[PDB]
From a paper:
Our structure revealed that the tip is similar to an inverted cone of 410 Å in length. We resolved all 109 residues of the distal tail protein gpM, which has 2 conformers with minor differences in the E-loop. Six copies of the 2 gpM conformers form a 3-fold gpM ring, which anchors the tail tip to the hexameric tail tube through the β-sandwich domain via electrostatic interactions. The protein gpL contains an N-terminal gpVN-like β-sandwich domain (residues 1–166), which corresponds to the HDI domain of phage T5 pb3. Three copies of the gpL HDI domains and 3 copies of gpJ HDII domains form the last ring of the tail. The E-loops of the 6 gpM molecules exhibit 2 conformations to adapt to the 3-fold symmetry of the last tail ring. In our gpL structure, an additional density feature in the iron-binding domain, which was surrounded by 4 cysteine residues (Cys173, Cys182, Cys205, and Cys212) and could not be assigned to any main chain or side chain, could be modeled as the iron–sulfur cluster. By contrast, in the lambda tail tip, the 3 copies of the 2 FNIIIs from 3 copies of gpJ form a closed cone-like distal end of the tail tube. The density in the tail tip lumen was modeled as a trimer of the gpI (residues 135–223) and a three-helix coiled coil belonging to gpH (residues 818–842). The gpI trimer serves as a plug to prevent the early release of the gpH oligomer and DNA from the tail tube.
Author numbering:
A (entry chain T), B (entry chain R), C (entry chain L), D (entry chain W), E (entry chain V), F (entry chain U): 4 to 156
G (entry chain E), H (entry chain C), I (entry chain H), J (entry chain F), K (entry chain O), L (entry chain D): 1 to 109
Amino acid sequence: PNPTMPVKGAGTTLWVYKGSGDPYANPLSDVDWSRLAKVKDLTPGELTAESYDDSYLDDEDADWTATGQGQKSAGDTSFTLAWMPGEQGQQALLAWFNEGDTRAYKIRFPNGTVDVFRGWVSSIGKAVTAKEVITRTVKVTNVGRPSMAEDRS
Amino acid sequence: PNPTMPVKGAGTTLWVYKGSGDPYANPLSDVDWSRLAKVKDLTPGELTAESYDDSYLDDEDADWTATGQGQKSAGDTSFTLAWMPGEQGQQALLAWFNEGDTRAYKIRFPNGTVDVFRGWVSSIGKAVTAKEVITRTVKVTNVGRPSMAEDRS
Amino acid sequence: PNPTMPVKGAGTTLWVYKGSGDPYANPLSDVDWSRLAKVKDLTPGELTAESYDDSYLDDEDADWTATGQGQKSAGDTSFTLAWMPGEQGQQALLAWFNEGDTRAYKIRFPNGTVDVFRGWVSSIGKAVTAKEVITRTVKVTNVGRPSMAEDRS
Amino acid sequence: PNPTMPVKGAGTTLWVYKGSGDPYANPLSDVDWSRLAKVKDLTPGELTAESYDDSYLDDEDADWTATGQGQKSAGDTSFTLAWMPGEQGQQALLAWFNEGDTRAYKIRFPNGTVDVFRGWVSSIGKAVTAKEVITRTVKVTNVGRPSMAEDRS
Amino acid sequence: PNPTMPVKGAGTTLWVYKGSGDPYANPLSDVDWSRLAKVKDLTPGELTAESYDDSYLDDEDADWTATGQGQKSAGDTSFTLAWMPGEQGQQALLAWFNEGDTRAYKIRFPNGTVDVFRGWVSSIGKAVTAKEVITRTVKVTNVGRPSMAEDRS
Amino acid sequence: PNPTMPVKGAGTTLWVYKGSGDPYANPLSDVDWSRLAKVKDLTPGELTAESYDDSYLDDEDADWTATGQGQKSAGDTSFTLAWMPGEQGQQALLAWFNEGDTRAYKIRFPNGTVDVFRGWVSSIGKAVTAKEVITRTVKVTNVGRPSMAEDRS
Amino acid sequence: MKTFRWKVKPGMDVASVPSVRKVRFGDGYSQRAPAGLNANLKTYSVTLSVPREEATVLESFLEEHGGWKSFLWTPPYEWRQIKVTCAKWSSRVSMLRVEFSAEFEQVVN
Amino acid sequence: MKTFRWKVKPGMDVASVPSVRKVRFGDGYSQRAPAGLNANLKTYSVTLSVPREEATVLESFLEEHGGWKSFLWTPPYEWRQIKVTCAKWSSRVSMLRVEFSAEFEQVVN
Amino acid sequence: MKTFRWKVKPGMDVASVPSVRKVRFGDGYSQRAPAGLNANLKTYSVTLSVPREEATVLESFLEEHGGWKSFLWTPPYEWRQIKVTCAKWSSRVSMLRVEFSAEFEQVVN
Amino acid sequence: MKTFRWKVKPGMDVASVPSVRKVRFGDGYSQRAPAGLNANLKTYSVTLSVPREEATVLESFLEEHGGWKSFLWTPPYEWRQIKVTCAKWSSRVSMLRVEFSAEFEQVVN
Amino acid sequence: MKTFRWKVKPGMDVASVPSVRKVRFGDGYSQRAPAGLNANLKTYSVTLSVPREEATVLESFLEEHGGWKSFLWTPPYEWRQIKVTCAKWSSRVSMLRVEFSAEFEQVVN
Amino acid sequence: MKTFRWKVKPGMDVASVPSVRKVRFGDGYSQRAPAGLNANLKTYSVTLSVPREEATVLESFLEEHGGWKSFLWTPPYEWRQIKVTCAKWSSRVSMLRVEFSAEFEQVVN
């Protein structure tokens, strides 16, 4: 577990907060965090930002256009996991979807770093095939400001 | 039949309600449910939702955007089953299409749970191939509130 | 020839009505029906319908959207057949295209069932290749009400 | 040379009219017709038509839509022939492009039938490859009424 | 070097005019022409033309639409060549780009024919790969009237 | 190290300026330049320009369109480097993203020349795979006038 | 009285403005009462699409009546025969079809 | 009085403008006071869609009231029964359904 | 009188409005009658495009007549020769073609 | 006096039209001078989005004041508390949310 | 008299409204006759695009004449030199180019 | 006098209309003369965007002058200092930046 060296993705886990307090403070403790098990694929959201135009008439170098950073935004998070409706985690997931609310979900990595977001559930799907496990596909739209793993170092 | 463990897709059956009463109450009984036979493919609809804007001026953190869940909606259900015009199920399907109506249809899984929806028929197509069986392609548009498998546990 | 059993597509034929009367009545008789021969591929049209919105303010369950069936419509029928300008059928096809008119065309299946539509010709094309038979591609836009095989059963 | 039997595309030749008179009358004579040489590809235009709406309120069957044929139109004819600027045909082709003009061109088939169109030149391109012959890609947009092979029989 | 026979593309070269006068007159002399060396791929622009409409009410044959050639235009020329920043040609290319100007560039073919255009530089890019030569990609937007090889024959 | 001869892409390094002064003056010194480590991919932005219409009525040659260069602009620069949150470079990268700011970044090549740009960060993303290294995908949008390799020669 | 046998196209617009006598000063007490017996007379906005050849017959039918004479017509909206008058109509001639726009006003006489 | 039973599509516009007496003095000072004893009255603007067969019933209902009689209706905005009068209305007749647009003003009478 | 030779591009708008004398009585009854002895006169609105070289001929032809002289023209709408007069016109000069827009009133003179 | 606690949404428009006295005949010499002390009073065009349940409270707050009474509000544009009056407001009811549009005019008294 | 040497952009609009005397009461007999010798005077709506540096020269040329003085200009429409006056012009400044819009009116004097 | 410092975004509109005294005689002849001794005065229309924190400074600067005092400013159009006055202005407050709209009339005073 060396943060300063490349690591493989195997061992990543997904967690859901089910407590009261501030998830951003001490997210390294699993107390008051549930877990979604048997995740097949995970695609974390990409943080983006839009642009405002900053070109004026009074400036001299008008040949080349210029711009500047606008209001940032965090993208959507999608993951596919095995369909086990009898498990507590997926029932909590459906309750999360039905009662539209923003709840914090944590991502843990093989090295000792975690990633915390806040978002509501935007999509739930299913895929049925004769020779494969039934899969539950979920997409979560993040809201607010994330807590990247680089903050705590 | 363990709901808490992953299952394979083989064995899924499709049913159409042909009675009077509440489809959502006791959908585990096959009485008053017809059966569509020999389904080659099945694509359940994906539950989605739209996003309203939750950004104000009076707040302090203006760097990152905010939003929230809006009015949810159920998706479109598609399946392809073999063309058997002499069977009762497909005659019921054509009567369902021609008479604009919304009726409940059940999806049964290898594990002991079912999925119940409600929607009208939006499309019917056919596929003719020289060396393959003629198939009937049906698209059903869901209306209202679904009754997922997680509700009854 | 068992309508209640799956069938392969081999043996499908295409016919064009060239008489006076009601094609929908007794379409099982080939009298007053011409034939288009040597068809390479056949893609029957898909019957569709558009959706209106049925959500109100007075209802209680405002979380999920609702809708309903609108005006149905029949899609386009496309087939590709070998190019023989000397045959009567293709000359009748060209006369059909030039004189914009709605004429009934019948599709016959290996099992004892037929499908009758009505439409004008919307496209005629050709493909020339050095080592393949010259092909004539036709697309017909259906108009009105079709007569599917499930009606007569 | 049997029109009533399928033929292979090999042997198709392209001709350009360079005379005075009626192109459509006796197009089976090669007098006053030039020839483009060594055509690699040939894609004849597809005759099409637009649809006007034929739905009224006074009719009884409002469940299904209705329509009808409108203005027909001939498509675009494109071919790729080898690059030979010293030949008379390609010089005539460039003069055809530079001078905005509509001229008739004949497509001859292995069976004893010809196809005559009328259109101007809409595009001219070139392709240079290290190990392949330089090709001249030409696109022609038809104007007016074509004269297919089924007319003369 | 026979213009009247097909030729392979190998041997094509690219030249840039660096003198004062009329490039279109005697373009077969390399005096006052620089050269861009080690070209990997070359895609000469395609000459195009737009269409107006020529259908009136007073004419009789209203079934088929008609049109006519509009204002011609020459497309964009793109080529990819090896990145050699120390060479004079690529420095001339960047001076061409920064000082937005229209300059004539000549294409020479294995047969004794040349193609002369006029255009400004519209794009300059780069592609870096670990196991391949660094490549400089250029796109030039032609302006005015070209001088095709068919003119001088 | 021959600028006049083609070179292979292996050995390219990426640097970020962290000093006070003029980045464009003497960019061949590594003092006050940080180094982002283990870059898997790199896609430099493509310099482009927009076209204004130079067509008038008074001119004689109206057959062909005319245009000219307008405002130039530098593109977006994309790279993907191995995920190492403990390294100084990636912490600087996240600080660069979070604080809306335009900073100069240098691209060094196997031959003795450099490329210098100036822009803000427009996107940050992550990719997690079971059997591959976690990577950090960054997109930087250039602002102003770039300083290519051709300038200092 | 001649009859109108042509067929209208989707989108026919029925505008009704009942005639009423109301007196109200400022925001005060308000009184309302009908103006007469046949207070509500609807005006139908119709659109017709007919080929090039058939345009002359429709144009002659509308021109012969003028704005004064009234003909019988049964609207698709309520299916009850009424007497209407067409005071203005506009044609938009195309290559193969002609599109008509007109306003039919219900009349008592 | 009869009650309005049919339902309203989303997009209802509620416009409420009070009436006041304003006097503007020299340097931005002013006098403001309500015009009348009674509270202001809103003007709900509604749109609704009904099938072809049920359009005649609603049209007859709005017709018998004219523009002078008031009927009870419970707006979804506040869910309290009020008295409204429809002075004018229009309908667009499609192939399957008819869409009504009307303005229900509120009256205390 | 000279004849108009050039052809008209599709989209011609034929607007006809008759002139009537209306009196509106109490209970919806009324009096209607034509205003003049002669039949109404249409107002064809046309659009036509000609090459740059031929634009001068059409402009001179419309200029010589001013806004007071009338010329014969056979509209495609009914295919019968009539007398029309063009009070005003406009043109938009492109690179290759000039597009005229004018309104041909019909006069019996 | 009451205070406004709801939060406005992006797009608030602040219009300023200072009151000034100017005399100018034709193009001649022009003289300008202020009209009074509180010459510049801004009107704020706000837009508010609230759920279905909380629309009643905001509507009641805007209604009980009428056009006359004034309340305290701290605009997000300059962050200085001022006294405004809401003379007119309009609501657009949706399935889950209600959208308010109003104009707040600053006042001295 | 100075001349205009700049080149106009595609889309010139030439508007011609001949001056005529017409008398017509109601729908009766109509009489028309020209008002004078130079009845038809066209106004050319031109559009010019010039770089930043050359905007000052064109602006000065249009400013020194004012609305009164007349200059010679050879329109691309008919290629005959005429005397025109520019009474109004608006400039839309961009980053590298300036776009002019003006109306030139033909005059006799 | 204070000088305007903030910069203007592309799209500035410069509108100049001179004042003339025109008389139109019989056959197209006329009399034209300038109305006044002084040259005409342009009216620049500008649009500029500044961050939220700097918006207060610009708003206070424009409010200080009211609509009667003039400030020096050098338009990008011609690069010569002139005297301008802003009679009215508006601003649209977004999340991060405020965008102003104003028209700077040119005054010789």
